């Protein structure tokens, strides 16, 4: 929760309209409970905070926030080689880290590689 709030306050200090309210965050977290267990609360928290605070951002920051929440959750859940693969994927998307990833189970990674080899950046 505090990491998500730090990301949201970074967004708020970027642009004036993109601010975040602490009371809004508590209301969203309460409505999570209104609408392996602890991981299920964490999953519902991520899904609901995105579903509420995505509409306050434009499309480009929508992709920003979506991909960075997916990255944060997957760093928390998966292993170190997975994290290295994700960082290498973001680097080759950033034209900075152009190299082989720790490709292995992680089925969606081959689909991401299929998307990126054809230079389908938007996909």
From Swiss-Prot:
UniProt comment concerning the protein's domains: Dynein heavy chains probably consist of an N-terminal stem (which binds cargo and interacts with other dynein components), and the head or motor domain. The motor contains six tandemly-linked AAA domains in the head, which form a ring. A stalk-like structure (formed by two of the coiled coil domains) protrudes between AAA 4 and AAA 5 and terminates in a microtubule-binding site. A seventh domain may also contribute to this ring; it is not clear whether the N-terminus or the C-terminus forms this extra domain.
Residues in the signal sequence: none
Role played: Cytoplasmic dynein acts as a motor for the intracellular retrograde motility of vesicles and organelles along microtubules. Dynein has ATPase activity; the force-producing power stroke is thought to occur on release of ADP. Required to maintain uniform nuclear distribution in hyphae. May play an important role in the proper orientation of the mitotic spindle into the budding daughter cell yeast. Probably required for normal progression of the cell cycle.
Family that this chain belongs to: Belongs to the dynein heavy chain family.
Subunit structure: The dynein complex consists of at least two heavy chains and a number of intermediate and light chains. Interacts with DYN3.
Protein name: Dynein heavy chain, cytoplasmic
Top-level division of the source organism's lineage: Eukaryota
Localization of this protein: Cytoplasm, Cytoskeleton
Note: Present with 195 molecules/cell in log phase SD medium.
Organism: Saccharomyces cerevisiae (strain ATCC 204508 / S288c)
Lineage: Eukaryota, Fungi, Dikarya, Ascomycota, Saccharomycotina
């Amino acid at each position: 929760s505090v990491k998500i709030f730090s990301m949201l306050e970074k967004f708020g200090q970027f642009h004036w309209f993109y601010g975040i309210s602490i009371g809004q965050f508590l209301s969203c977290f309460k409505r999570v409970f209104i609408k392996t267990r602890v991981d299920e609360i964490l999953w519902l928290l991520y899904q609901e905070v995105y579903c509420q605070f995505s509409t306050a951002l434009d499309k480009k920051f929508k992709m920003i926030m979506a991909m960075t929440m997916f990255c944060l959750y997957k760093f928390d859940i998966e292993s170190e080689q997975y994290k290295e693969a994700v960082l290498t994927m973001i680097g080759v998307l950033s034209e900075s880290s152009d190299g082989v990833p720790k490709l292995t189970t992680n089925d969606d990674l081959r689909y991401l590689w299929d998307y990126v080899t054809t230079k389908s950046y938007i996909s």
